[PDB]
Design a protein around this ligand. Structure first.
Ligand code: HEM
Ligand code: HEM
Ligand SMILES: N=C(Nc1ccc(CCNCc2cccc(NC(=N)c3ccco3)c2)cc1)c1ccco1
Ligand SMILES: N=C(Nc1ccc(CCNCc2cccc(NC(=N)c3ccco3)c2)cc1)c1ccco1
Ligand SMILES: C[C@H](O)[C@H](O)[C@H]1CNc2nc(N)[nH]c(=O)c2N1
Ligand SMILES: C[C@H](O)[C@H](O)[C@H]1CNc2nc(N)[nH]c(=O)c2N1
Ligand SMILES: [Zn+2]
Lengths: 419, 415
């Protein structure tokens, strides 16, 4: 019918009708809630492979209808011609091509619909690099390098997405094999331990197994592994002058810099699929800027990531014999102060979790006021530290799936057949 | 389906949930929208005879299956006996064994409770023979004295007579048995606990003479058989309290903070086999963050971050200094150190979440699942450094269950 959400700190009640437009299953039912499952649903808008006409065209008509509605047409000459044009195109190529305006609209709205993103107040401010003319891995690398340079902007980070050719028959996919454009290698040591980033151990072995010479350090920027038109992937080294990095120091603990920690400034997600009117863009690296907790809480303090809590706590002279001393919690705060202080000192864009969550509450108010709603995944929006002293903790949220969207996709090495 | 799988993304352990097939009540989600973060998704509304028949049957069957006597002659006679009561009286009475089993399984089934590794160690106080508010007071005092146990806390529940026609409900009007008053001042400020202002006002109106301090234990407001509720002062020697000091900050004790040892929830409804026990106060012990993070640092609560940060000499001009986060940790260190030094049972969020993972895996082993509400199970601070953060969970509603119910002052017909 028409669902309300309340913020238990301010008592603001919001009334959602936008959820009436959602198409895909969430995974939940009236009897089971899947709100904490990472991939709860496999409901897709299109079938396994190259769809027939009655499969692709309805999705296309829906997107075109929606875009022309967005600009106060619908039924206009251009809209009706566009339907004819997409119709003939599917008839003659089993697919269709988005106009440049449609492509920008869909990317921005995929971000606007990303239930899990705390950063969406910026959604309409997004630079879109059309890369659909690309044909080879070298061209992909040229496009990605230009993306990184524009997005980094000497530290004043700018949001951007680069969109490579859409999927055609499933055998000609463009893929960035890296999960992010810039990540650190991880190495499996002989004494069982792990050097660098443990999350990236498998991808690092693929790179080494592809001819990459590992420097074998704690912060080795990985090479790019780029696949164009279903061909075997190719390795490229991002020119280091394009990889902005921030050494981590602490504003009171002088010894903190001696931990030898750094991180990169540009988070650039390169393994997701962008879905627009039944078209699948399997390579659409997008970047924005970090929330400090991403680095200082998850990257640094997860147990299967860098796991630096004991080292920081030891240097802090903390009681580490029992959990009740909250030594982990004390170190966790100091690490996150350091990450923030370091980025702001080098004038690299970063947002703390207090300001970011406040902005999202304000984004929520705007979206209900003009759009009748805002899909939001509480499990992902609430920051991984100090949850209840941020406003989103006390905010009820409705989660639902709107298109266009960003979707997960399989890692290509589970699917690729080499040649 | 027929199986469901949950994964822990930190350990990669995968558990297989079959128990969700037994759930019968709604979560509030639909196939196309998730309401996992909604907090809540008439008096005449008591079950008809026909509604009660299958609910009673399901519960009696469950009970006899639990004790490996399903299909037994005792099982078949109990079932027939329950039917006679429902036909003749429109309701039925649980055996003591069934009451104990049901109370324990409501706890086991509470998807939002992180302390369920203890579910089967629960002292059930059968108070179904109670008839007056003076009697409820007596029962509640004994509950408090037992549960508190000089600081060695023991979980317990006291169960008052079930609902009949909805016009003779037993209710504890208090939200917890021990809770601090709050007073709104003319200047708009608040003395005491801001969460309890409305209930403090109801108390004063009923004749409570308030000390108007910052930590006044509220009186009991007790309702028996649907009569007007009555006031009782819990004997102070039964209210165990812990003054909050810090292991390193000499100054912390000068904040004058204290809290009570015994969390005892008194406003929920226990549903067993279709019978509704509108008054069922239950108690365990605290996880430190309930006090240190929520009670003390919520802006709508005691809201002491700013005072603690000041004494800590933090830079409070910008959020990104993380002064709030820094002050929050120290407050929670104090709460834990204070309870431990006074030998009053308490559990930190790390110990508790790890025990819950162990409990959850055991439930999957022996029971085929464990409904769990991630939004509630993850602690309100340092979430991702606890193991439950990385634990996929399935949320579904099993009965017997603890339920929310309206505040009694929103429905009571004053006599
Ligand atoms: C501009 C600053 C931005 C900030 C501060 C931000 C913040 C975040 C954070 C902290 C997460 C959680 C990530 C994790 O825990 O793994 C997230 C998720 C996400 N963000 Fe944003 N984001 C920003 C921009 C963008 C842009 C430009 C896009 C795409 C155009 C985007 C799309 C997404 C998506 C799709 C997810 C969900 C990913 C998933 O489900 O794994 N974000 N965001
Ligand atoms: C033995 C130690 C226990 C611990 C450490 C514990 C811990 C917790 C915590 C931290 C919460 C969340 C509280 C909040 O945020 O408001 C909770 C919720 C809950 N607990 Fe437990 N608990 C314990 C015992 C019990 C017992 C004995 C019962 C009942 C017999 C119980 C039933 C519940 C229920 C029903 C909820 C859900 C509350 C709601 O929906 O609002 N717990 N528990
Ligand atoms: N980690 C596992 N799986 C896994 C599951 C889900 C994910 C999603 C990761 N999205 C990373 C991500 C996504 C979105 C935003 C950011 N950040 C930003 N600010 C940003 C980037 C661009 C704009 O803004 C980071 C990643 C991995 C795992 C452990 C064991 C087995 O699998
Ligand atoms: N206060 C509001 N709403 C609201 C607040 C709280 C709730 C649920 C609170 N359960 C309190 C609770 C419940 C269960 C356990 C504990 N703890 C224990 N350790 C314990 C007790 C017994 C055994 O163990 C505490 C529901 C609604 C609000 C905000 C704005 C307007 O209203
Ligand atoms: C809006 C949101 O559902 C609400 O703030 C929840 C979040 N998780 C919680 N978790 C616990 N343990 N206790 C709570 O009161 C809440 N409140
Ligand atoms: C099991 C749980 O869903 C998983 O650990 C989630 C929890 N919330 C998250 N929230 C964010 N922002 N990012 C994450 O990776 C996760 N992981
Ligand atoms: Zn759900």
């Amino acid at each position: 019918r028409f669902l309300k959400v309340k913020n238990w700190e301010t008592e603001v009640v919001l009334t959602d009708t936008l959820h009436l437009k959602s198409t895909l299953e969430t995974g939940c039912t009236e009897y089971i809630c899947m709100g904490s499952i990472m991939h709860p649903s496999q409901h897709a808008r299109r079938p396994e492979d190259v769809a027939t006409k009655d499969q692709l065209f309805p999705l296309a008509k829906e997107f075109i209808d929606q875009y022309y509605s967005s600009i106060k047409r619908f039924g206009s000459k251009a809209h009706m011609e566009r339907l004819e044009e997409v119709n003939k195109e599917i008839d003659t190529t089993s697919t269709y091509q988005l106009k440049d305006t449609e492509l920008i609209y869909g990317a921005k709205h995929a971000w606007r619909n990303a239930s899990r993103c705390v950063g969406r107040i910026q959604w309409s401010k997004l630079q879109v690099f059309d890369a659909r003319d690309c044909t080879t891995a070298h061209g992909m690398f040229n496009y990605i390098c230009n993306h990184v340079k524009y997005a980094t902007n000497k530290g004043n980070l700018r949001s951007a997405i680069t969109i490579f050719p859409q999927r055609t028959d499933g055998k000609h996919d463009f893929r960035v094999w890296n999960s992010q454009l810039i990540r650190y290698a991880g190495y499996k040591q002989p004494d069982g331990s792990t050097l660098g980033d443990p999350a990236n151990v498998q991808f690092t072995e693929i790179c080494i197994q592809q001819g990459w010479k590992p420097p074998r350090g704690r912060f080795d920027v990985l090479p790019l592994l780029l696949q164009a038109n279903g061909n075997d992937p190719e390795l490229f080294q991002i020119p280091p002058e394009l990889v902005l990095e921030v050494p981590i120091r602490h504003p009171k603990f002088e010894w903190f810099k001696d931990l030898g920690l750094k991180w990169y400034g540009l988070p650039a997600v390169s393994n997701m699929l962008l879905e627009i009117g039944g078209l699948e863009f399997s390579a659409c690296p997008f970047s924005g800027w970090y929330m400090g907790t991403e680095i200082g809480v998850r990257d640094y303090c997860d147990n299967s990531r860098y796991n630096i809590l004991e080292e920081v706590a030891k240097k802090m002279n903390l009681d580490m014999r029992k959990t009740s001393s909250l030594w982990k919690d004390q170190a966790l705060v100091e690490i996150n102060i350091a990450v923030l202080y370091s980025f702001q000192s080098d004038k690299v864009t970063i947002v703390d979790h207090h300001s970011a969550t406040e902005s999202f509450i304000k984004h929520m108010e705007n979206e209900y006021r003009c759009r009748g709603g805002c899909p939001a995944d509480w499990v992902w929006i609430v920051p991984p530290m100090s949850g209840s002293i941020t406003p989103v903790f006390h905010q009820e949220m409705l989660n639902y799936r709107l298109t266009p969207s960003f979707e997960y996709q399989p890692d290509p090495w589970n699917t690729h057949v080499w040649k």
